Amino acid sequence: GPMSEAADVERVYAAMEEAAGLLGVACARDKIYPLLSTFQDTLVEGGSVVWFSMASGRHSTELDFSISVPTSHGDPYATVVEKGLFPATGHPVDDLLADTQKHLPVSMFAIDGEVTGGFKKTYAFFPTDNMPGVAELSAIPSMPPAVAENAELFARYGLDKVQMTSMDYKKRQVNLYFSELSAQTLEAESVLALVRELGLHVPNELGLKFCKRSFSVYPTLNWETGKIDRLCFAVISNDPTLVPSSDEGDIEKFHNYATKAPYAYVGEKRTLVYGLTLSPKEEYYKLGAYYHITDVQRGLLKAFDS
Structure with a gap:
């Protein structure tokens, strides 16, 4: 009932504080709880996907949280803008989530924030049996021109x-x-040819072995140029030792997070998503540990972590 639902949101916030504590990061409740409350139903209803993400290097003092939102709820960016939880940018990125649903079958949404900065990002998921290609994505008028401009490059590398x-x-x-x-x-x-063509940090053989294991690869694009800002390779696993770094502090910090991050599906092993991110001037590492999982994450583990 009303109290049990309110307590669920407290529990998610307490888990967020726990995960952030593993990094020495303190959470700003006044930035987070309004968001959690706005999306209380998704956290209560079930089918929830929640994950808490950390990063290496110049990013190590942040914790991100992502929370799935059903499409039946409606565009979660319009929600946060109308509620004043985030100021509208005045730029095409404002339109892109709603535009994507106009043009394509979207199976789910998600919202993402940082524990000290608040809301920052939305996600659009497509059905696993009905995913768009680059050409369909570039039919969305608010999508960056960079998508269509890199179409030739994406096709050449099989993306x-x-x-x-x-x-x-x-x-x-x-x-x-x-x-x-x-x-x-x-x-x-x-x-190698991809990252070299994009002018990004060239990985070593440890990074390449990680890339070979990836279930997903994601470039970052923007509306100002056709240049791809960075490229991330993602690996999903129950294995807590996979961070692709030879730095002893990295190895320790990521194994620590991977073995202590809060999660609710006790009785199973934590679902982890590692990321290897290549930018022009550096390489850095990410790790998301899921607090709430569904069959999708279990199916991905079976396919890619066996």
Whole structure:
């Protein structure tokens, strides 16, 4: 009832504080709870997907949280704008989530915030049996011109189907999460030519071995240029030791997070998503640990963590 639902949201917030405490990060309740309350039903109803994400390097003092939102709820960006939880940008990224649902079958949404900065991003998921390609994504008028401009490049490397997209409203960037990756696409020669063509940090063989394991690859694009800002390879696993770094502090900090991050599906092992992110001037590491999982994450583990 009303109290049990209110307590669920307290529980999610307490887990957020726990996860943030593993990094030494303190949570700003006044930035987070209004968001949690606005989306209380999604956290209560079930089918929830919630994950808490950390990063290495110059990003290590932040904790991100992402919370799934059903399409039946309606565009969660319009919600946060109308409620005053985030100021409208005045830029096409404002339109992109709603525009995407206009033009394509969207199976789910998600919202994402940082524990000290509040709301920052939305996601659009597409059905696993009905994913768009680049050409269909570029039919969305508010999508960055960079998508269509990189179509030739995406096709040449076999980056075709997209399982979801994410919109960053503060940086005005879009991520395209490519799926159904072929082994040719993730072979070291292919990855090397890709990152070299994009002018990004060249990984070593440890990073390449990680890339070969990826279930998703996502470039970041923006509305100002056709240049891809960075590229991330994502690996899903129950294994807590997979961070692709040879730095002893990284190895320790990520294993610590991967073995202590709060989660609710006790009785199973934590679902983890590692990311290897290549930008022009650096390489850094991400780790999301899911607090709430569904059959999708279990199916991905079976396919890619076996």
